[PDB]
Design a protein around this ligand. Structure first.
Ligand SMILES: *C[C@@]1(O)C[C@@H](/C=C/C(C)=C/C[C@H]2CC[C@@H](NC(=O)/C=C\[C@H](C)OC(=O)NC)CC2)OC(C)(C)C1
Ligand SMILES: [Zn+2]
Ligand SMILES: [Zn+2]
Ligand SMILES: [Zn+2]
Lengths: 869, 65, 93, 842
């Protein structure tokens, strides 16, 4: 047919957070929080009266925000925002509360676009007095801009100063509070020049991480590499300790199992081991690192908040003798979910931006101090083998005042009207680990959440009963039975090898330990082992949150595929097939085998009755019904299975699939196989002769995540790299002729990874649309155009907004949507709707060029949204 | 063009090209948020732990020559 | 010949061009579509060279632009585009 | 070899001329000779020589020592014949050797300084910059104590000028080592009980620190103010004046923050206002004027009401510097929040306009500019009419400079605030004064023209009753003998055409147009350009149908004017022809249009950019008017018969025709011209195609298939020029249709572009690489990688060379996108090559 011209609109913006900063961005005494959703920059204001977070501004930057920090000049009243992007540009923005916008104050160019290896953008570090900023790549190149003001108190930026060093990798960069001395930047570096020239591998283990200091001489106007000290163990990030008049200058290196304080000069290095959890159910060989940090300065004191992998937040104070620091002091603050950023606001509030799942705003009630809880120090003696210990407990120092809904990460979605309403509902299997959930979303959206046990992988709907069959699977996790067994063995080890006459005490303590089941929702789940896997099959009613039936699996059995289907051999009684891998190691990949569970689904879509368990060579990754039988992908093999009394019986197989089958969908006697890397493959089943012959493939490699057949010859697919393509077969293609290649009729970079495509109609009596979901929690739609007049209009709108309203963080919009493939027949409506955010003169000029009026253009865009299609 | 890391010449070995593209890939994982998200969901580890493991792999991502 | 591009890191200085080369693009020698403003490094705008043509160091009258083709191919993201004659001293010409 | 030596270089490098075996050299003279050779290679030499000699002189600087180096450098720097760039080279070598000789230069500091300090007071801005740079590097190397000991004696010297030089040097070392590093020394010297010159010089140091460092002293502003505050009540008068001036410089540097740091200075200044007189009073007032804009609104009101008495008193001061100081102080006061407008209108305005606005002030340029800008700033708060009405009557004055002054002031005020504040009386006063000021002109004041235009455009439709009185003066002025006066009147018409149209006086504008029509013979070119611009302004606002003279009569009179060689005339004439062609094209026959075409085609190669811009625009207009066929055929004939630059102009004109009339009108005929056996015609067609696609950009998204067969043939025509131009065509196509779905045709053309990558000719391989890069951005880096992989590793070394060149182009182009396109390389025995992370499946 004709090439499909599409229009892209985001209905639900991305909800995950990768960066969060706090400051006085309004210029008033109120404190706001700037967050990065990925391709979206957002401003939030927590109300200290009601303790609830409101969103004041949300902006699509059309780029990849890799680094975000705030700064303030000397004697200033408002905080600026420096953004490191995937363009070769640095941008400094000022929030204007009157106009409610991000004014781009400065934009300076240094390199090429993309998340590159040697082009700055990934790391951002500002001097605590606001005199300079440093943007750094992960390798070699580093650049420093000097910030000042002018007569009119407007920010001014200088030319970049080169601080490059070849063959040097960067783990983290942060500025040092050296008061008003020459500004200094601390970096966690490592040189790989030695490791590459040693064919024996000795230099690899011999090379060690260094802490290096870069000094910016203002009077000489140049950057110099002064001090570079090797470190004992490798650290993941740095914390700026307050310096100058209110604090001793220095840095805090967070490493695996340790936190060190170090400063230039005669300052001795002061390290302290990280307090492990008492009766930790994890693996003893597993280390412990900090995932994020926060800093809160008062005229009186200052403290740090550091969160571990297990979600434990510790308060850290520094005790100092005159200029030098004596010791580091650490005490257990609380336990919140694993966060990517923490902000300690003034007026007593803590903001936790979880790395996955919902976000939280707590009120600080008691900082501590008046606590009987043990405080630990770097001076307390401890043998080389032993460490500190503490016991987790329910919240004490924080109180939940607000919870923000976040759909990230969405792993599967089905749009259907399972309730008897008229409008379809979006059933979204999202969340991670113990914080996973299936959420029902209705007409920006209204969400109802039902908690799950592990990370959902795929769910299918039972047509007759409208119930949901979910599979949840997580890596390096313990099953319920294995968790209880580990608890019992730990309790048995506790009583034995203890002192006699105090073994009575060991027994009561171990009984208390066995009785305590700590909520995995808040405290995380005890997860350990390299090749361990926890999997669960669940049956859920879409109306209530009730689970109808549940099946735990083996300690190394991991479910990856599920389908519900009727079989031709056995009448209309339903069945449930579940593909499972055994002893799966991700890196390097190694698997023992796979199994396929066949269940009966005996009750009215409420109970699973185990029929049998079929073994197979590799992991069954895809299972789809096919005219009374089933199609199963195992490794790179595509087989047709039929129900047998004691097994699933192979009847025909295809071997010539490129790499590995990750999903298969059929229409007619055509099967569409998704490869992990080599994109789609069109195979044909011949009922006569019983053979599966490959008759078409693609000309480009695609790391396919999901797919959806639009028509008989057209397939829509999604990338791991956040792309969507539409590929169509030649019209006269014969399933007899093998050498046929498909044509790509659509390409478009969403900027976020898509895991579900579905062609549906969101509002009855509307047009059809292609709804996609996002791994970062977003929901979007692609709408086909009805006429060429509308197409030309919206295309000219895209062009004029590309020119007159460029992306906020220096990116080029046409380049951005062409991240991995050039754009083909898609219009960015998320850009077009920014016509309403421009200034009156720009809107007038664009409307006059379109031979229209501004309200008319706004009306047209709003009408496309009213169609939702 | 010699200064830009990753470029090659007629005497570029297999190992050099592949370690170049491996370090490129790791930096691209660090840059693109949803790629790192996918990775952290697969292997159940915190985002910071995945970033640290990637930076650790930056030394010899493929092994010695 | 002996003429090469500066290619140092470009700063806040705006590139400048004389009358005979008013609308030309520094890289591809085209007049079609001025796009992005040329930035030169901090040395090439010092002293007598301030506000001078990028090709000759003569008195400049208009801002220098990369073209649209060069902007698309990100040739504006390369080094400082000022021309230097490797066979002439600072005092000559 | 050895660089060329000018006459002046002989004195300093004579020893290098004689050829002496360097074995028979004294150890000292051995070093002198090498320093001479290194400095000569640095000063006169190619950039490679300069870089190598810099490396050599810096690496061996410690071995060389500081004495001999600085001895050879200082006379070289003190040469009166030193060109400005040579000084910069010497300053850079000084910095790079001073970094190496940290403590070695401590003996010679003094000597260096006495050579370097004059540079701090030179008229050249960059000379002062370089002096400050080398003194900063010296202070960084020598250390704080060495510099303090070296420069401390001259602090008390009787000669004021040596004290000034010393204070400037100390400010430089303060910027070099930081304010706190010199804070105790300054605290000590500012209260020195020995002499008053010491404290005067310390306060001068603080003043120069402010002047030099600006906003950077805000951290230590309280420290500097507390160190300096005592000088305001000292017995010495000069130290009080200099302390007030330093306070003024500090307030100017801290704007607008840090008023709280001057808290201990307000009352001493307030008392000295009533106490002192003369220069000290001027310094106090300057300090207060720079201090007020830092205060709160209510405290600004209080303090300004407190000082206003003496501020008004000093209006009638005989001292010109005092007048300038109090004028700037008034400008600063009335520009702050807190000083109320009614207060200014009551207390400040009458004495202001009594004592300041006199003819005398118009004579001095500095006072002229100061008073004009200050009065405009006053109008920005007290209202436009409240200022204009007090000097509007002075527009009818005997002295011309005073009329010029009031005209500039009224122009700037009404341009900033419009004319909503003006009543009828002030409107008539304005008009009757402006007409007399325009009629009474000895020279051709541009200020009068700008002011007339600004007032008329600000009044808008309110000028209708005066339009006959204005056009009468304009007509009487166009008859004036002076040509510059005629062009002034024409430019007034050009600026007021829009308001004249809004006033519905179209008959007056028709009379103006018909009067300008007869002047199109003006021999003086500038006046001709101005009247052409006036005719254009009249055409562009009144209809093409009611325009007198009619267009059918006007345009043929414009036709021969395109042959004029003056750029103003050319630009204005082409622009008027374009205004005629855009909408009035029906009144002019196609033959006259073809003649206009022939003159425009010659103007496409003018050196001024604006002329080519206008020529392109108006040629597009006349091409839409004429139609494609006739002009297209004659342009193709011109393409055949002509070569060199005039062929490039026909190429540009063909592209213009393709943009205006769809390329479907031009491409068939051009491709048909390719069919002629002669090779030169084919080359012309290929150049036309290249520029056509580069020009039309996205418009060519439908014509790639059409031109594909011709490109197939030309990419295999043996002639290297053919393939070079065809690769340029593919390059421009790819760049032009980027993101519009032309992947099929461009991928097809890639297969014909590819075999030409094995070619040694430099121009054609450059063109092929450009085409490959354009195709990379249009198709995607994935396809280019697919074409590169087959030969990235290959037994042939030349094949590897070429394919790696291509792959480097692609990799630099899009390194991040390639992460998705690298092939699977399986693990071997020794190394792990598979990217396992991408093989994860959820
Ligand atoms: C730096 C420089 O290359 C400058 C050249 C001067 C070249 C001149 C004067 C060329 C005339 C020539 C230009 C190209 C053609 N005309 C043309 O393209 C006209 C208009 C275009 C479409 O628009 C613009 O130019 N817009 C700005 C034919 C005529 O001198 C040297 C010394 C070579 C150095
Ligand atoms: Zn260009
Ligand atoms: Zn340069
Ligand atoms: Zn020039």
């Amino acid at each position: 047919r004709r090439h499909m011209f599409l229009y892209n609109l985001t209905l639900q913006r991305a909800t995950g957070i990768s960066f969060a900063i706090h400051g006085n961005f309004s210029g008033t005494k109120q404190q706001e929080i700037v967050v990065s959703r990925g391709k979206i920059l957002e401003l939030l204001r927590p109300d200290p009266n009601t303790g609830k977070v409101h969103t004041l501004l949300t902006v699509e930057v059309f780029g990849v925000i890799r680094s975000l920090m705030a700064f303030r000049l000397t004697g200033g009243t408002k905080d600026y925002i420096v953004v490191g992007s995937d363009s070769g540009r640095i941008v400094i923005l000022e929030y204007q509360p009157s106009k409610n916008m991000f004014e781009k104050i400065h934009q300076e160019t240094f390199g090429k676009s993309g998340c590159r290896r040697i082009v700055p953008g990934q790391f951002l570090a500002v001097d605590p007095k606001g005199r300079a900023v440093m943007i750094s790549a992960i390798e070699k190149q580093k650049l420093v801009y000097i910030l000042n003001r002018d007569a009119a108190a407007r920010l001014t930026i200088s030319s970049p100063l080169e601080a490059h060093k070849a063959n040097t990798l960067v783990y983290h960069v942060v500025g040092v509070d050296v008061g008003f001395e020459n500004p200094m930047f601390a970096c966690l570096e490592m040189d790989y020049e030695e490791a590459d020239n040693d064919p024996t591998g000795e230099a690899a283990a011999n090379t060690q991480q260094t802490l290096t200091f870069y000094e910016l001489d203002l009077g000489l106007n140049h950057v110099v590499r002064k001090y570079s000290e090797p470190l004992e163990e490798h650290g993941n990030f740095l914390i700026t300790v307050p310096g100058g008049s209110d604090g001793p200058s220095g840095v805090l290196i967070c490493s695996e199992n340790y936190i060190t304080y170090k400063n230039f000069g005669d300052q001795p290095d002061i390290r302290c081991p990280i307090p492990r959890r008492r009766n930790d159910l994890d693996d003893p060989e597993r280390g412990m690192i900090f995932v994020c940090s926060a800093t809160h300065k008062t005229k009186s004191m200052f403290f740090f908040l550091a969160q571990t992998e297990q979600g434990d937040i510790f308060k850290i104070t520094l005790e100092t003798d005159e200029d030098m620091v004596t010791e580091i002091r650490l005490k257990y603050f609380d336990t919140v979910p694993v966060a990517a950023a923490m902000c300690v606001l003034k007026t007593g509030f803590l903001f936790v931006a979880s790395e996955f799942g919902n976000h939280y705003l707590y009120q600080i009630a008691h900082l501590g101090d008046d606590d009987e809880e043990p405080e630990f120090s770097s001076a307390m003696p401890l043998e080389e083998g032993d460490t500190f210990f503490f016991q987790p407990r329910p919240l004490k120092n924080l109180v939940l005042v607000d919870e923000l809904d976040s759909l990230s990460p969405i792993l599967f979605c089905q749009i259907a009207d399972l309730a008897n309403e008229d409008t379809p509902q979006l059933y979204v299997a999202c969340g991670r680990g113990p914080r996973s959930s299936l959420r029902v979303l209705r007409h920006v959206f209204n969400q109802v959440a039902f908690p799950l046990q592990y990370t959902p992988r795929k769910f299918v709907i039972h047509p007759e009963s409208n119930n949901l069959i979910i599979i949840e699977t997580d890596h390096n996790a313990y099953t319920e039975a294995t968790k209880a067994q580990r608890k019992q063995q730990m309790a048995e080890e506790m009583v034995e090898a203890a002192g006699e006459d105090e073994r009575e005490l060991a027994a009561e303590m171990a009984a208390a330990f066995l009785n305590e089941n700590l909520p995995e929702s808040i405290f995380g789940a005890p997860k350990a082992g390299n090749g361990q896997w926890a999997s669960v099959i669940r049956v859920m009613n879409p109306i209530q949150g009730n689970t109808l039936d549940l099946v735990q699996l083996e300690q190394n059995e991991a479910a990856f595929s599920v389908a519900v289907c009727r079989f031709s051999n056995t009448g209309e009684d339903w069945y449930v097939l579940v593909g499972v891998a055994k002893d799966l190691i991700l890196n390097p990949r190694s698997v023992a085998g796979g199994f396929v569970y066949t269940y009966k689904l005996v009750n009215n879509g409420e109970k699973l009755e185990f029929l049998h368990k079929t073994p197979v060579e590799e992991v069954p990754a895809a299972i789809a019904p096919f005219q009374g039988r089933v199609l199963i992908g195992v490794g790179k093999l595509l087989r047709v299975y039929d129900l047998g009394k004691k097994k699933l019986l192979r009847k025909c197989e295809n071997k010539h699939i490129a790499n590995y089958i990750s999903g298969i969908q059929t229409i007619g006697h055509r099967v569409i196989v998704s490869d992990v890397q080599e994109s789609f493959i069109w195979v044909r089943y011949k009922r006569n002769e019983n053979q599966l012959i490959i008759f078409a493939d693609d000309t480009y490699p695609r790391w396919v995540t999901t797919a959806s057949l639009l028509d008989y010859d057209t397939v829509a697919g999604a990338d791991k790299f956040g792309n969507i393509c539409v590929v169509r077969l030649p019209p006269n293609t014969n399933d007899e002729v093998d050498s046929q290649k498909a044509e790509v009729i659509m390409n478009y970079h969403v900027g976020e990874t898509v895991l579900s495509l579905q062609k549906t109609t969101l509002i009855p009596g509307g047009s059809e649309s292609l709804v996609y979901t996002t791994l970062s929690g977003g929901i979007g739609i692609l709408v086909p155009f009805t006429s060429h007049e509308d197409h030309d209009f919206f295309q000219h709108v895209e062009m004029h907004l590309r020119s007159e309203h460029p992306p906020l963080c220096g990116r080029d919009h046409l380049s951005f949507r062409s991240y991995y493939f050039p754009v083909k027949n898609v219009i960015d409506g998320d850009l077009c709707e920014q016509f309403n955010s421009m200034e009156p003169n720009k809107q007038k000029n664009v409307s006059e060029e379109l031979d229209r009026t501004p309200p008319e253009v706004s009306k047209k865009l709003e009408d496309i949204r009213t169609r939702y299609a | 063009q010699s200064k830009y890391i990753g470029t090659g010449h007629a005497d570029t070995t297999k190992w050099e090209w592949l370690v170049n593209q491996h370090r490129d890939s790791y930096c691209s994982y660090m840059g693109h948020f949803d790629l790192l998200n996918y990775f952290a969901i697969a292997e159940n580890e915190s985002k910071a732990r995945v970033r640290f493991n990637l930076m650790e792999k930056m030394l010899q991502p493929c092994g010695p020559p | 010949p002996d003429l090469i591009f500066c290619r140092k890191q470009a700063g806040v200085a705006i590139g400048r061009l004389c009358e005979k080369c008013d609308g030309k693009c520094v890289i591809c020698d085209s007049y079609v579509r001025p796009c992005t403003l040329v930035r030169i490094c901090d040395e090439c705008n010092y002293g007598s060279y301030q506000g001078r043509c990028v090709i000759c160091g003569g008195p400049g009258v208009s801002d220098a632009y990369y073209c649209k083709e060069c902007t698309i191919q990100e040739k504006d993201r390369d080094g400082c585009p000022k021309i230097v004659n490797l066979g002439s001293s600072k005092t000559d010409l | 070899n050895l660089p060329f030596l000018k006459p002046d270089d002989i004195q300093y490098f004579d020893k290098l001329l004689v050829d002496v075996d360097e074995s028979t050299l004294s150890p000292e003279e051995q070093k002198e000779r090498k320093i001479m050779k290194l400095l000569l290679k640095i000063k006169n030499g190619t950039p490679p020589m300069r870089k190598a000699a810099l490396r050599q002189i810096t690496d061996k600087a410690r071995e060389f020592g500081a004495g001999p180096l600085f001895n050879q450098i200082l006379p070289l720097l003190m040469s009166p014949t030193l060109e400005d760039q040579e000084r910069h080279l010497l300053v850079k070598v000084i910095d790079r050797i001073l970094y190496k000789l940290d403590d070695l230069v401590r003996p010679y500091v003094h000597k260096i300084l006495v050579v370097i300090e004059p540079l701090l007071i030179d008229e050249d801005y960059y000379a002062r910059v370089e002096g400050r740079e080398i003194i900063s590097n010296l202070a960084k190397a020598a250390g704080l104590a060495t510099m303090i000991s070296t420069m401390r004696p001259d602090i008390d010297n009787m000669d004021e000028y040596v004290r000034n030089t010393t204070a400037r040097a100390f400010a430089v070392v303060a910027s070099a080592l930081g304010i706190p590093s010199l804070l105790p020394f300054l605290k000590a010297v500012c209260k020195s009980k020995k002499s008053w010159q010491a404290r005067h010089t310390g306060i001068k140091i603080v003043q120069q620190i402010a002047i030099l460092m600006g906003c950077a002293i805000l951290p230590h502003l309280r420290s500097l103010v507390e160190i300096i505050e005592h000088g305001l009540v000292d017995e010495q008068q000069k130290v009080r004046t200099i302390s007030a001036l330093a306070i003024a410089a500090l307030a100017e540097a801290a704007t607008p923050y840090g008023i709280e740091s001057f808290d201990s200075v307000l009352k001493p200044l307030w008392k000295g206002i009533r106490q002192h007189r003369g220069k000290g009073l001027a310094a106090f007032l300057k300090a207060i004027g720079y201090l007020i804009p830092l205060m709160d609104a209510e405290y600004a009101n209080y303090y300004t009401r407190e000082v206003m008495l003496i501020l008004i008193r000093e209006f009638q001061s005989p001292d010109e510097e005092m007048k300038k100081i109090v004028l700037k102080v008034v400008k600063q006061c009335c520009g702050t929040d807190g000083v109320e407008a009614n207060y200014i209108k009551t207390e400040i305005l009458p004495p202001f306009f009594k004592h300041f606005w006199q003819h005398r002030m118009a004579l001095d340029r500095r006072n002229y500019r100061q008073l004009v800008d200050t009065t405009v700033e006053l109008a920005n708060k007290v209202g436009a009419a409240e200022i204009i009405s007090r000097i509007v009557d002075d527009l009818k004055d005997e002295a011309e400079q005073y009329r010029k002054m009031v005209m500039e002031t009224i122009e700037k005020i009404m341009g900033n605030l419009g004319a909503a504040d003006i009543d009828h009386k002030l409107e008539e006063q304005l008009i009757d004064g402006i007409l007399y000021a325009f009629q009474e002109q000895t020279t051709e004041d541009s200020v009068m023209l700008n002011g007339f235009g600004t007032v008329v455009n600000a009044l808008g439709k309110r000028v209708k009753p005066y339009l006959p009185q204005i056009c009468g003066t304009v007509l009487w002025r166009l008859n004036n003998k002076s040509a510059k006066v005629r062009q002034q009147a024409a430019d007034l018409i050009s600026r007021t055409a829009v308001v004249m149209k809004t006033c519905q006086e179209e008959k007056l504008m028709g009379h103006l147009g018909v009067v300008l029509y007869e002047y199109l013979g003006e021999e003086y070119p500038e006046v001709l350009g101005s009247i052409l611009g006036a005719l254009k302004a009249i055409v562009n606002v009144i209809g093409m149908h009611k325009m007198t003279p009619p267009i059918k009569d006007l345009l043929p009179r414009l036709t021969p004017i395109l042959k004029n060689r003056h750029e103003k005339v050319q630009e204005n004439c082409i622009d008027l022809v374009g205004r005629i062609a855009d909408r009035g094209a029906e009144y002019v026959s196609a033959r006259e249009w073809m003649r206009i075409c022939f003159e425009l085609l010659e103007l496409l190669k003018a050196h001024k950019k604006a002329i080519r811009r206008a020529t392109v625009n108006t040629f597009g207009y006349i091409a839409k008017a004429i139609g494609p066929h006739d002009v297209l055929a004659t342009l193709l004939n011109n393409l055949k018969v002509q070569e060199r630059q005039n062929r490039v102009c026909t190429t540009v004109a063909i592209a213009i025709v393709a943009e205006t009339c769809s390329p479907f009108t031009v491409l068939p005929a051009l491709m048909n011209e390719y069919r002629v056996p002669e090779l030169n015609v084919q080359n012309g067609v290929l150049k036309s195609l290249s520029f056509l696609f580069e020009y039309i950009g996205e418009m060519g998204k439908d014509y790639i298939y059409a031109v594909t067969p011709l490109l197939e043939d030309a990419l295999m025509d043996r002639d290297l020029v053919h393939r070079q131009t065809a690769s340029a065509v593919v390059q421009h196509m790819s760049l032009g249709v980027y993101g519009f779905g032309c992947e099929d045709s461009l991928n097809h053309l890639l297969n014909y572009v590819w075999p030409n990558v094995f070619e040694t000719s430099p121009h054609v391989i450059q063109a092929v690489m450009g085409a490959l890069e354009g195709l990379r951005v249009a198709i995607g880096p994935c396809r280019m990688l697919q074409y590169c992989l087959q030969g990235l590793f290959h037994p042939a070394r030349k094949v590897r060379d070429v394919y790696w060149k291509i792959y480097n182009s692609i990799y630099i182009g899009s390194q991040d996108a390639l992460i998705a396109h690298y092939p699977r390389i399986y693990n071997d025995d020794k190394n792990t090559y598979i990217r396992y992370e991408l093989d994860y499946i959820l």
